[PDB]
Amino acid sequence: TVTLCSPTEDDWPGMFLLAAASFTDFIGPESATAWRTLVPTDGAVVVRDGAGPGSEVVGMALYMDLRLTVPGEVVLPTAGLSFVAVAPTHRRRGLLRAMCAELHRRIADSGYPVAALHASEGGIYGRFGYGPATTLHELTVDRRFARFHADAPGSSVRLVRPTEHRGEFEAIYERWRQQVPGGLLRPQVLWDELLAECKAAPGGDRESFALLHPDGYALYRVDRTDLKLARVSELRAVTADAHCALWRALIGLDSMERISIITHPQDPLPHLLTDTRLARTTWRQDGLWLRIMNVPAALEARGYAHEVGEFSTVLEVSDGGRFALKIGDGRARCTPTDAAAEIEMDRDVLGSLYLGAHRASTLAAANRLRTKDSQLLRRLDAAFASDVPVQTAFEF
Amino acid sequence: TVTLCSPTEDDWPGMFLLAAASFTDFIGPESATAWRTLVPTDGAVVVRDGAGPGSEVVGMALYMDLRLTVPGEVVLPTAGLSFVAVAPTHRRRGLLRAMCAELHRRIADSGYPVAALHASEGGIYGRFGYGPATTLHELTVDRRFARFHADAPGSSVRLVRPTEHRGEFEAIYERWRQQVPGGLLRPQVLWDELLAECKAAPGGDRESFALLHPDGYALYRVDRTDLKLARVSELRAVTADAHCALWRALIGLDSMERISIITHPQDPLPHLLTDTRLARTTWRQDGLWLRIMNVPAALEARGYAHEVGEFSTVLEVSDGGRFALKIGDGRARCTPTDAAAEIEMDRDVLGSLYLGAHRASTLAAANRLRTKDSQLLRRLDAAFASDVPVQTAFEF
Amino acid sequence: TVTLCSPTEDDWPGMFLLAAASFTDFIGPESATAWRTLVPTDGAVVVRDGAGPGSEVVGMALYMDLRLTVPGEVVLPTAGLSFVAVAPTHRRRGLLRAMCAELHRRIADSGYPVAALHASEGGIYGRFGYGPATTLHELTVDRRFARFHADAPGSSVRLVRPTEHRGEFEAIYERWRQQVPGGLLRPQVLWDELLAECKAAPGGDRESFALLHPDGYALYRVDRTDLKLARVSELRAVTADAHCALWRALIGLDSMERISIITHPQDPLPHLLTDTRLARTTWRQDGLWLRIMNVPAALEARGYAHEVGEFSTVLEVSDGGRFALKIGDGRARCTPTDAAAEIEMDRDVLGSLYLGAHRASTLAAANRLRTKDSQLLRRLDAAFASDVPVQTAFEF
Amino acid sequence: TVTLCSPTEDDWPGMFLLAAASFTDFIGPESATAWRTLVPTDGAVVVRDGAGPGSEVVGMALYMDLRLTVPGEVVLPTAGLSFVAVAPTHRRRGLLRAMCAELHRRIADSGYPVAALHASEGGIYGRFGYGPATTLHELTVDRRFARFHADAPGSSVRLVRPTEHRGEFEAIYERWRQQVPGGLLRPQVLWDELLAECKAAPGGDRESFALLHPDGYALYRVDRTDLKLARVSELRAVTADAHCALWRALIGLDSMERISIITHPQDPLPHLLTDTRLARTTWRQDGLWLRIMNVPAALEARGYAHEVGEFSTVLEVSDGGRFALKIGDGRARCTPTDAAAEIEMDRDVLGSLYLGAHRASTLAAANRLRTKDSQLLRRLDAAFASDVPVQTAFEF
Numbered sequence A, B, C, D: 001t002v003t004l005c006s007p008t009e010d011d012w013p014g015m016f017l018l019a020a021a022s023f024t025d026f027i028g029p030e031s032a033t034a035w036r037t038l039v040p041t042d043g044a045v046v047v048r049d050g051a052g053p054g055s056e057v058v059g060m061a062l063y064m065d066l067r068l069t070v071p072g073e074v075v076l077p078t079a080g081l082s083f084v085a086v087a088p089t090h091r092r093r094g095l096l097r098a099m100c101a102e103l104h105r106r107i108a109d110s111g112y113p114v115a116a117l118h119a120s121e122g123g124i125y126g127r128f129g130y131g132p133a134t135t136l137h138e139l140t141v142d143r144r145f146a147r148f149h150a151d152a153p154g155s156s157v158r159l160v161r162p163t164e165h166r167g168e169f170e171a172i173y174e175r176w177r178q179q180v181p182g183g184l185l186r187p188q189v190l191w192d193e194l195l196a197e198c199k200a201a202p203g204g205d206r207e208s209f210a211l212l213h214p215d216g217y218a219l220y221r222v223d224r225t226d227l228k229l230a231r232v233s234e235l236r237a238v239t240a241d242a243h244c245a246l247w248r249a250l251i252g253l254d255s256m257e258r259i260s261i262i263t264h265p266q267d268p269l270p271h272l273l274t275d276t277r278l279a280r281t282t283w284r285q286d287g288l289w290l291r292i293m294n295v296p297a298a299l300e301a302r303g304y305a306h307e308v309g310e311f312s313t314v315l316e317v318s319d320g321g322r323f324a325l326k327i328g329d330g331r332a333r334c335t336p337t338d339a340a341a342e343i344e345m346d347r348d349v350l351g352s353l354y355l356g357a358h359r360a361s362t363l364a365a366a367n368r369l370r371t372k373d374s375q376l377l378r379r380l381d382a383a384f385a386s387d388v389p390v391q392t393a394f395e396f
């Protein structure tokens, strides 16, 4: 009756239909490249309603091969789930759960240590062992009142057309994503897609003008309806001077009232200004989500805080076994075991901690991670913290 | 021309006038008590147009004796600036600056370690040495979709008339403030104020109600116009079990479409729900600001992370002296010095970093605090962190 | 523990709290009159948390002696549920279900053929055997353009002070409710209340005025905020001429832009105007709900369309026994039986038909009332219609 | 002075100017086809300013050949007026009255028993003998709270590209319109237009997708700006089951918050849900308007309610002559008479009653329909009713 499998040339039309209705943003021409370019052999799956070539496609999901920067500037190959969809005619038949379990096994066999996604909704993926792992705050600062603090660092920047500086953006982005927990390698095909979206579209987005610095850039587009608002689609800075030079320039768009940007909680913008309130937060939400596929691999992969002295504990993941984890001198040793578990937690929660965006003590407060040793809490809080604040790279 | 000095009895009326026209929330009857029983003798100063008694009151500013909890569960006597006002007629004449110079002087003399306030605007007090020290998050939660996580702790709480449980509120409050950095001793005169406010005002706010658990409580008043919005004026809890029980009951306001609360960034509410987002962040702003009056006094009083290995640096506060600072064992020694400064900052930067609500590394990136050692940045971040996350008490 | 009982004197306060925290419209002094003068001995019920006197009140519900005009102008004493509440701390533990079961046992033993309520939400009382039985249409008319048709009937009306003409209103309202299915007799305590609400409340509703006509009246008041909107709280007309006369005068309120009223689907107001669209439906929702307590009594009490030819059938009510139903000469005869059921439905469906507001054929398309014979659908459609279209009396 | 005549080939441009400047939705290319294809030679007329080829077009109006289904599954040839426009520079000189009189004579002279239109404004066509004959209810349903009742009927339907199933749709819509009062025959040239209007348009509507059942279908698209809102363009169902299963699917659009749709008052959606309120009515207005050209032909053409007993009366239509109307066994005999009229009414009232969308009892309360005999009034309500509730086909 219902089949779950890797597509063949026959399901393509099924997937194309399902994808278009399901994703408002999605279109056929732009989409064809992404999948060919970023999806491994059998990192894609479809649910067929029956059997026979041409059997209707009622579910799809696939993962891309991407490189994630975790704390300590390590890069972990990462499975990135995307284009997850069930047809509206088949809701609640276990199809999403089935598709994830299949994808997870393949990722596990492929030797990925983590998986990742951006959630359409907040309540879906926790059950499949994804915890939210970065935070995205919409930023809008009125530009009419902003003055830079006397301390702020800093003309060393140029207004340019984006299509004429792709190479510069690429270099800059590559340095940045290698330095920031959350960075993702952006392959040529996504520069293509990102680059094209700069050109104005009839009935859609306006032309986008870049701000270019040797160690940073910013792409910004005037809003479609509110002609007094500028939207920064992306800002990349490797140094604090470029970050501040770019902001002085954005603040400099005198024909604008407001500037808005998606950014991280540790963005220093507020502090560059005389009135930190001007860089107001207008939206707060989860960004990238992580699933730890291989506990030992994942915990040994990432660097830890040096500023916490050596300690040892047994961590138990609900129905993922037990682990002896040792962290000292910024490194971890994690191996399976059978000793009593000093601390226990669902798999999704471990993800939430993996990058440093969530403190273990808060989750503890919500009974999402348990233990009887208050001292161990503080140590994990400390250990798992990121020296460099986590940043979100691009949605996928 | 004009004249700065302590207010006599003849100056009262004039001040109330100035206050009512400066602060839309002011009231003549309600304040007389808080100002009178909480403002120390000669804690209040005014500026008069010319001389000869009863001169027109044009500037005013006073402070209150309050006890602030800081990291390590230590209470510091604190001076809380309030009813700072210059008349519309005398703006930008240095009255605010002069009134500040005067009170800081008195405050220094009188033996206060530091002075705190709440800021009407965002770019007034930094120059005077105040730095934003805690963060306010408005959470707006859609009650209808909320569902508690299986991990969530939890009937032990009863819907009560606030004026009937003063004692149990007060005791609960006392437990909370002695445990939460940012906690404030609540004066009896302020329990009066709060108890009185619960009553419905014709055309004003509606009656408040309370939810009472042995180890926590909540006051909530239905909003004046959105009859589908319950506003929580104050949520107080001392155990994870109370925090959750109270929320299980807030989500149980079935007639409400949403619940709103002013809380702190580390509030575990979101993690208690199967959907993290439902606890949407709506309004974000700075709350309690700190002016460190005595650097060694303050720095030595607060406890520090044990999970950071002992270390030594030389801190220079601009206009704040130079001290050799050493942290180890959760304690700090701070002693004058003329060695080269390894790290410098404006005085306000010290205050923001004092409760742990800001990371030294983020401020560094705005060049608000500067150093050439990166390992030290990390050490500060870790040292100044707070095992217990900072919470805000009550505006004043 | 959880005790379910008729409220004693010791409970009154417990209820005032539970009511005020449950219904924003609640007032203690005024509501005290209705339970006392309209609720039968043991027509009220409360749930107490535990044992001891003055235990806390965590659920409440009561039923007032309701007189109802059903089709045929027949008046049936009916139990009207009101002030149903379960505390937010005790929601989902079966208290509503428990309070209902009990009141129902009381209502049946007392002889009431049927029960009625107004539902706070739409998904509650179906499972208890109440169906939405009347429709409310909120009508907003932009009178700046309203012109009367040449056929519209019609200064035989007067502008009056409502509190000077209570008796005229009682007499008028008396004739009206005896004639219209949906009428309820309005007792003296309720007229006290209605008249009381006509006076201005500081920070509340403005003074109400009345339009008085020999065969009808309208009470209306200018809206609190929108000074160009008139709210008619009540319009009662015995004659088509009264209805038109009243609206002529309301369209005559030259200082208003809109007039709004809550009325029924067959209100002929639109057809009085040269442009039907001017009476725009700005709100539609279920109104009175009916639970048939005694199927034979209720069915025999109600009038039925004379035009439809006589006929017999056997109607089953889901777990409510089977029933021989004969309709002829606009009358019914209905007695328990054991014949095969020709038609069947959940008790609440019957409620929805009882007053002609919902077609048998419509309910059947949703499989809510089930029959193997089509002819019988159409016969039920014809029969249960009401010559006079059902209107809504007052909310309770 | 001015002239009224049939449009020659030289008037085509002027007509496109007038049409385009009087209708915001008008497009020259799409329209070309319907008028030539659907407008009969001579079914169109224009008014000119002056004489001499080239004169400017200041008035147009035409009719199309339509097939309307009326009670009894009977299909009347009908005349549909559309593209009625007087230039803003000639408003109020009688051009419409002049254009209507001419069209009506041609329409009668050609042997149509009934003309129909959609009214741009509600106070325009009544004077010309047209009366509102169907009702449109705009229903917005929040998808998230919707749960199907345990009784509801119902994977038997699938998500498809509309242009790949023209035949399946043509079939279904064909069975629909033959069964439902209000049905229209859809011309191949209009299926052309419907299919084309399904492709996305830059700055316009988004791609339409469809839901396809053996016995029904639904075309929907996500809204232009409201990305959480799904507009159903048209919904066709011939079985209750289809109607349900299609609604089971639209509710299955999880990415959406709201589905909206235009339908009729007797839509059973709400009764499919656990909460009838979820099927909120957000708009309600008259749809198809009818003018009975030929009283006997029309009254003898449509089937009547069987469940009313044979009866007789005298029906007098102002300006429409007098008739002995006799209804027996669901059929009507209507013949010329000079006997005393038992009931009188304007031509448009008869329009309104014709498809069963309005009750005579209600139009009588407006004194639009007049009789001294209430029993007679009940008999008309009963007889004119429809076994199948009337729905609206398409706007023309």
Ligand SMILES: CC(=O)SCCNC(=O)CCNC(=O)[C@H](O)C(C)(C)COP(=O)(O)OP(=O)(O)OC[C@H]1O[C@@H](n2cnc3c(N)ncnc32)[C@H](O)[C@@H]1OP(=O)(O)O
Residues within 6 Å of the ligand: A022, A081, A082, A083, A084, A085, A086, A087, A090, A091, A092, A093, A094, A095, A096, A097, A098, A117, A118, A119, A120, A121, A123, A124, A127, A396, D254, D255
């Ligand atoms: C961009 C990315 O690819 S990530 C964003 C996801 N993409 C989309 O959501 C596209 C549109 N929406 C959909 O396609 C569907 O709603 C899907 C794919 C999310 C759901 O698939 P389904 O087959 O209906 O879910 P499935 O029944 O397999 O899941 C089972 C459980 O998940 C739950 N579930 C499914 N959707 C949701 C939801 N939106 N919120 C909470 N729980 C959910 C079910 O309640 C069920 O509960 P259970 O664990 O007790 O069994």
Ligand SMILES: CC(=O)SCCNC(=O)CCNC(=O)[C@H](O)C(C)(C)COP(=O)(O)OP(=O)(O)OC[C@H]1O[C@@H](n2cnc3c(N)ncnc32)[C@H](O)[C@@H]1OP(=O)(O)O
Residues within 6 Å of the ligand: B022, B023, B081, B082, B083, B084, B085, B086, B087, B090, B091, B092, B093, B094, B095, B096, B097, B098, B117, B118, B119, B120, B121, B123, B124, B127, B396
């Ligand atoms: C609850 C509490 O009491 S805290 C909130 C304070 N109360 C109020 O704001 C009441 C209404 N507003 C006011 O009373 C006035 O605006 C005050 C008291 C805040 C300002 O006093 P003033 O005398 O007008 O300012 P003054 O000239 O003395 O201050 C000097 C400096 O502060 C700066 N300053 C004063 N107000 C502001 C402001 N709103 N934003 C930024 N800078 C400001 C001046 O620009 C000036 O800058 P400078 O250092 O380069 O010279």
Ligand SMILES: CC(=O)SCCNC(=O)CCNC(=O)[C@H](O)C(C)(C)COP(=O)(O)OP(=O)(O)OC[C@H]1O[C@@H](n2cnc3c(N)ncnc32)[C@H](O)[C@@H]1OP(=O)(O)O
Residues within 6 Å of the ligand: B254, B255, C022, C081, C082, C083, C084, C085, C086, C087, C090, C091, C092, C093, C094, C095, C096, C097, C098, C117, C118, C119, C120, C121, C123, C124, C127, C396
């Ligand atoms: C003016 C009047 O008095 S009439 C309007 C009703 N009064 C109110 O709503 C007052 C404010 N709200 C409340 O007091 C509560 O939410 C109540 C009284 C509606 C609910 O009572 P509760 O005791 O919490 O629910 P209870 O457990 O008794 O009900 C049982 C069933 O009804 C259902 N139910 C209760 N409330 C709702 C609701 N708002 N919507 C849908 N279903 C509901 C439950 O789902 C439960 O379902 P189940 O059969 O699967 O177990």
Ligand SMILES: CC(=O)SCCNC(=O)CCNC(=O)[C@H](O)C(C)(C)COP(=O)(O)OP(=O)(O)OC[C@H]1O[C@@H](n2cnc3c(N)ncnc32)[C@H](O)[C@@H]1OP(=O)(O)O
Residues within 6 Å of the ligand: D022, D023, D081, D082, D083, D084, D085, D086, D087, D090, D091, D092, D093, D094, D095, D096, D097, D098, D117, D118, D119, D120, D121, D123, D124, D127, D396
């Ligand atoms: C989709 C369709 O094709 S059907 C809908 C019609 N289309 C449009 O209306 C498009 C834009 N509007 C117009 O073109 C014009 O307003 C028209 C065509 C409706 C009116 O034509 P006119 O030539 O100005 O009116 P005309 O003088 O011929 O009609 C006479 C009477 O009708 C009345 N009338 C005309 N328009 C209206 C109106 N919008 N509302 C009420 N009455 C009107 C006049 O009052 C006039 O009064 P009277 O009965 O006392 O004599």
